[PDB]
């Protein structure tokens, strides 16, 4: 009965890139096929001279058999009709690292505490998602207040991803 | 077989298992016919691509899908794929074996022709 | 929008039989089209050191799929040996991932070649 | 109470097995010299089977030496390398089946290990 | 200029193999490798200045590359202990030598560029 | 019967490097095992400031299965107790070409018409030759006057090489 067509999903109203900028710690992730970022994931969002959003994540990636490396990622966001939906073009400073171009949705945020992002990589023909990833971010790495957690769970439920998120560990594995 | 293909992984030190291989032959006008195709086995070899009969003369392209192999392992590789291009059987009977050694930013390719 | 001109693309060829720079080798470059055709892009021949410089500018070299085709067969025949390969193709995506310099290097033998890339952050 | 070490050698120039390439295998001792461990020559297909048996193939550092020089000199060329030299630790975690492979040219060789369980 | 140069490339990362330990030896009258020259690869993957025209004399040489140190310092478990390149040098007039090695965990190629 | 010990072979008395200099065409060759120079062989002999002899040579070499190339050879002669016997260090300008260090003997010469050279590369224990090469040179590529031919045949006989020399063809293969 729950509508699962990605085009039916609520996104952030009048999303404001400027209030979104700064550091965001990844607290939980729903992996897509061919998962990339493992753990220790921290993003830094900015706004351009021209008003364009961009970001610069850091994280542990488990390559090959068991080769672990700290990826420095970079992504640039082009706008759309909808202030909360972007196309994200991304690659790592090191070229052997994954490159790509993904829809990038701010499903919800209050700018100060939490954000829920979503990405649909592949569609089924009924409009439901065949391959997606989703991050939950927080401004504070230790966790979320109960009010925030409650909203977040509600958003996980609406993306048809309830109970599918892996917990993101932070143990200083990527320290300069 | 008239044509065997062996692929190796220079990184993990093993056969490249499940590498998709797509052989083409050259048409009278200058495009390619999908001549044969398969996947490398557990030993990384592709036997049973063609027969002496069908394996006529002309220009042939062996195309090895390396990108898929590497992406399936985290890495954004440099090459789309490997292409050995060679004339075959212009003096009757010969058994060709294309061998590829694979790395993300490099590959080497070799032919072992006999008869 | 005008910038300083150091080569986004360098080719280098080496003779594994003679232990020397593979001099005067025909190298052709193509970019895959909307219709999946290879469009002629750049052309030249390797110098005395075995290097093809100045093949294209930062600006003209744009996000795409590229084929570097090296005339190995020409080099080997013009020298006496009968090569196995018609040419050596190097197929690769470039500029999809920040501004970078690329280096193709090919190492030549009659029945064998190897290619390798050096891309710089 | 099938050999655990196979060597395949190829000719990058003529495009065929390197036939009659002399291969000499050494192992490392307490004091740091090399035991003549095994000996042979590449066959008609360039492979060296029956170099050794599972049990004698004990743990340690091993050197596979491939005589490239002879191969090339017997064909007119003054090659660059004395020989090809693969050095690896074998069996420090139970058994394992190694295949050292070498691609040959007068001024270049590449070498690679295909290890199996 | 330099009669001997070494160059190292990383086949996995598509870049100069920076800070690689390279050791050189000359075979002795008694079949012993005498320590000859030593160093580490620069930013570009290039060990220049290993020796001089005069000191580099007819003999057999072993260039040993510490591939294993490189790979472990990156967290991969390599197959090779090191990479040896053994060659006769300077027996055929005065020439410049270039060793180049291209590295992978379970594989490497070496090549020579000697100039007349 | 005939004494075939290399040390018993008569060489040129008071060989004069200077009268020997200039161009000599190779007219016949007895190949050693692992043969190198095929045909079209021409040598240029010189003498240095120091009095040391050296030479150059051009010639067709067949490499691999059937790769033909013009070799540009160079050799330096160090002297010995005997003015007709040298050690020849040699290599090609192209390094892939054969190098080495061979005894080099002037068995006989005229300076003006013919030279007969000999090299013993490997000995049997009774002092006889196990691997040798020998060259017959002439100042004129067209051939030898009958008086020179007679001596040359006689020298071939005494090096125990009668009937074993291959004719060297000169068809301009090495020009341009
Ligand atoms: C007898 C040597 C040839 C004539 C003297 C020329 C010396 C200068 C050239 C360098 C030496 C190259 C000759 C070595 C070839 C050995 C015999 C062979 O061809 O198989
Ligand atoms: C949504 C990711 C974090 C916010 C954007 C950070 C910008 C850094 C650039 C892109 C990082 C690449 C993320 C793509 C991988 C997502 C799925 C995965 O890791 O398996």
JSON list of N, CA and C and ligand atoms in Angstrom, two decimals, chain F residues 29 32 35-37 43 45 55-57 73-75 88 90 104 117 121 133 135 137, ligand 1:
[
{"chain": "F", "resi": 29, "resn": "UNK", "atom": "N", "xyz": [85.00, -16.71, -45.88]},
{"chain": "F", "resi": 29, "resn": "UNK", "atom": "CA", "xyz": [84.96, -16.82, -44.43]},
{"chain": "F", "resi": 29, "resn": "UNK", "atom": "C", "xyz": [84.75, -18.27, -44.01]},
{"chain": "F", "resi": 32, "resn": "UNK", "atom": "N", "xyz": [82.35, -19.64, -37.53]},
{"chain": "F", "resi": 32, "resn": "UNK", "atom": "CA", "xyz": [82.47, -20.35, -36.27]},
{"chain": "F", "resi": 32, "resn": "UNK", "atom": "C", "xyz": [81.09, -20.88, -35.89]},
{"chain": "F", "resi": 35, "resn": "UNK", "atom": "N", "xyz": [77.25, -18.35, -35.99]},
{"chain": "F", "resi": 35, "resn": "UNK", "atom": "CA", "xyz": [77.84, -17.45, -36.99]},
{"chain": "F", "resi": 35, "resn": "UNK", "atom": "C", "xyz": [77.16, -16.08, -37.02]},
{"chain": "F", "resi": 36, "resn": "UNK", "atom": "N", "xyz": [77.87, -15.02, -37.35]},
{"chain": "F", "resi": 36, "resn": "UNK", "atom": "CA", "xyz": [77.36, -13.66, -37.18]},
{"chain": "F", "resi": 36, "resn": "UNK", "atom": "C", "xyz": [77.32, -12.87, -38.50]},
{"chain": "F", "resi": 37, "resn": "UNK", "atom": "N", "xyz": [78.48, -12.47, -39.02]},
{"chain": "F", "resi": 37, "resn": "UNK", "atom": "CA", "xyz": [78.57, -11.78, -40.30]},
{"chain": "F", "resi": 37, "resn": "UNK", "atom": "C", "xyz": [78.26, -12.75, -41.42]},
{"chain": "F", "resi": 43, "resn": "UNK", "atom": "N", "xyz": [85.89, -4.24, -44.21]},
{"chain": "F", "resi": 43, "resn": "UNK", "atom": "CA", "xyz": [86.55, -3.70, -43.02]},
{"chain": "F", "resi": 43, "resn": "UNK", "atom": "C", "xyz": [87.43, -2.51, -43.36]},
{"chain": "F", "resi": 45, "resn": "UNK", "atom": "N", "xyz": [90.66, -0.70, -41.61]},
{"chain": "F", "resi": 45, "resn": "UNK", "atom": "CA", "xyz": [91.69, -0.77, -40.56]},
{"chain": "F", "resi": 45, "resn": "UNK", "atom": "C", "xyz": [92.45, 0.56, -40.40]},
{"chain": "F", "resi": 55, "resn": "UNK", "atom": "N", "xyz": [89.62, -1.10, -36.00]},
{"chain": "F", "resi": 55, "resn": "UNK", "atom": "CA", "xyz": [88.93, -1.31, -37.26]},
{"chain": "F", "resi": 55, "resn": "UNK", "atom": "C", "xyz": [87.44, -1.08, -37.18]},
{"chain": "F", "resi": 56, "resn": "UNK", "atom": "N", "xyz": [86.82, -1.08, -38.34]},
{"chain": "F", "resi": 56, "resn": "UNK", "atom": "CA", "xyz": [85.40, -0.87, -38.53]},
{"chain": "F", "resi": 56, "resn": "UNK", "atom": "C", "xyz": [84.97, -1.92, -39.51]},
{"chain": "F", "resi": 57, "resn": "UNK", "atom": "N", "xyz": [83.70, -2.30, -39.50]},
{"chain": "F", "resi": 57, "resn": "UNK", "atom": "CA", "xyz": [83.22, -3.18, -40.55]},
{"chain": "F", "resi": 57, "resn": "UNK", "atom": "C", "xyz": [81.75, -3.03, -40.80]},
{"chain": "F", "resi": 73, "resn": "UNK", "atom": "N", "xyz": [80.14, -2.52, -37.28]},
{"chain": "F", "resi": 73, "resn": "UNK", "atom": "CA", "xyz": [80.92, -3.12, -36.22]},
{"chain": "F", "resi": 73, "resn": "UNK", "atom": "C", "xyz": [82.10, -2.28, -35.92]},
{"chain": "F", "resi": 74, "resn": "UNK", "atom": "N", "xyz": [82.63, -2.43, -34.71]},
{"chain": "F", "resi": 74, "resn": "UNK", "atom": "CA", "xyz": [83.86, -1.74, -34.32]},
{"chain": "F", "resi": 74, "resn": "UNK", "atom": "C", "xyz": [84.71, -2.65, -33.42]},
{"chain": "F", "resi": 75, "resn": "UNK", "atom": "N", "xyz": [86.02, -2.63, -33.62]},
{"chain": "F", "resi": 75, "resn": "UNK", "atom": "CA", "xyz": [86.91, -3.44, -32.82]},
{"chain": "F", "resi": 75, "resn": "UNK", "atom": "C", "xyz": [88.22, -2.76, -32.49]},
{"chain": "F", "resi": 88, "resn": "UNK", "atom": "N", "xyz": [91.12, -8.89, -29.77]},
{"chain": "F", "resi": 88, "resn": "UNK", "atom": "CA", "xyz": [90.17, -7.96, -30.35]},
{"chain": "F", "resi": 88, "resn": "UNK", "atom": "C", "xyz": [88.94, -7.80, -29.45]},
{"chain": "F", "resi": 90, "resn": "UNK", "atom": "N", "xyz": [85.35, -6.13, -29.35]},
{"chain": "F", "resi": 90, "resn": "UNK", "atom": "CA", "xyz": [84.48, -5.67, -30.41]},
{"chain": "F", "resi": 90, "resn": "UNK", "atom": "C", "xyz": [83.03, -5.64, -29.96]},
{"chain": "F", "resi": 104, "resn": "UNK", "atom": "N", "xyz": [92.88, -12.44, -32.38]},
{"chain": "F", "resi": 104, "resn": "UNK", "atom": "CA", "xyz": [92.81, -12.02, -33.78]},
{"chain": "F", "resi": 104, "resn": "UNK", "atom": "C", "xyz": [94.20, -12.18, -34.40]},
{"chain": "F", "resi": 117, "resn": "UNK", "atom": "N", "xyz": [93.30, -13.93, -42.07]},
{"chain": "F", "resi": 117, "resn": "UNK", "atom": "CA", "xyz": [93.16, -13.75, -40.63]},
{"chain": "F", "resi": 117, "resn": "UNK", "atom": "C", "xyz": [92.63, -15.04, -40.01]},
{"chain": "F", "resi": 121, "resn": "UNK", "atom": "N", "xyz": [88.57, -19.61, -30.99]},
{"chain": "F", "resi": 121, "resn": "UNK", "atom": "CA", "xyz": [87.69, -19.24, -29.88]},
{"chain": "F", "resi": 121, "resn": "UNK", "atom": "C", "xyz": [87.67, -20.26, -28.78]},
{"chain": "F", "resi": 133, "resn": "UNK", "atom": "N", "xyz": [87.12, -19.15, -36.41]},
{"chain": "F", "resi": 133, "resn": "UNK", "atom": "CA", "xyz": [86.76, -18.51, -37.66]},
{"chain": "F", "resi": 133, "resn": "UNK", "atom": "C", "xyz": [87.97, -17.98, -38.42]},
{"chain": "F", "resi": 135, "resn": "UNK", "atom": "N", "xyz": [89.03, -15.38, -41.84]},
{"chain": "F", "resi": 135, "resn": "UNK", "atom": "CA", "xyz": [88.66, -14.54, -42.98]},
{"chain": "F", "resi": 135, "resn": "UNK", "atom": "C", "xyz": [89.80, -14.42, -44.01]},
{"chain": "F", "resi": 137, "resn": "UNK", "atom": "N", "xyz": [90.88, -11.76, -46.89]},
{"chain": "F", "resi": 137, "resn": "UNK", "atom": "CA", "xyz": [90.54, -10.42, -47.39]},
{"chain": "F", "resi": 137, "resn": "UNK", "atom": "C", "xyz": [91.30, -10.14, -48.66]},
{"chain": "G", "resi": 1, "resn": "LIG", "atom": "C1", "xyz": [87.86, -10.92, -38.18]},
{"chain": "G", "resi": 1, "resn": "LIG", "atom": "C2", "xyz": [86.96, -9.75, -37.76]},
{"chain": "G", "resi": 1, "resn": "LIG", "atom": "C3", "xyz": [86.24, -9.15, -38.97]},
{"chain": "G", "resi": 1, "resn": "LIG", "atom": "C4", "xyz": [87.22, -8.28, -39.76]},
{"chain": "G", "resi": 1, "resn": "LIG", "atom": "C5", "xyz": [87.96, -7.32, -38.84]},
{"chain": "G", "resi": 1, "resn": "LIG", "atom": "C6", "xyz": [86.96, -6.25, -38.52]},
{"chain": "G", "resi": 1, "resn": "LIG", "atom": "C7", "xyz": [87.16, -5.91, -37.06]},
{"chain": "G", "resi": 1, "resn": "LIG", "atom": "C8", "xyz": [86.25, -4.73, -36.76]},
{"chain": "G", "resi": 1, "resn": "LIG", "atom": "C9", "xyz": [84.86, -5.27, -36.63]},
{"chain": "G", "resi": 1, "resn": "LIG", "atom": "C10", "xyz": [84.51, -5.87, -35.35]},
{"chain": "G", "resi": 1, "resn": "LIG", "atom": "C11", "xyz": [84.47, -7.36, -35.20]},
{"chain": "G", "resi": 1, "resn": "LIG", "atom": "C12", "xyz": [83.14, -7.92, -35.66]},
{"chain": "G", "resi": 1, "resn": "LIG", "atom": "C13", "xyz": [83.44, -9.33, -36.12]},
{"chain": "G", "resi": 1, "resn": "LIG", "atom": "C14", "xyz": [83.03, -10.44, -35.17]},
{"chain": "G", "resi": 1, "resn": "LIG", "atom": "C15", "xyz": [82.38, -11.52, -36.02]},
{"chain": "G", "resi": 1, "resn": "LIG", "atom": "C16", "xyz": [83.03, -12.87, -35.74]},
{"chain": "G", "resi": 1, "resn": "LIG", "atom": "C17", "xyz": [82.85, -13.95, -36.80]},
{"chain": "G", "resi": 1, "resn": "LIG", "atom": "C18", "xyz": [81.42, -14.12, -37.26]},
{"chain": "G", "resi": 1, "resn": "LIG", "atom": "O1", "xyz": [80.90, -13.31, -38.04]},
{"chain": "G", "resi": 1, "resn": "LIG", "atom": "O2", "xyz": [80.69, -15.08, -36.91]}
]
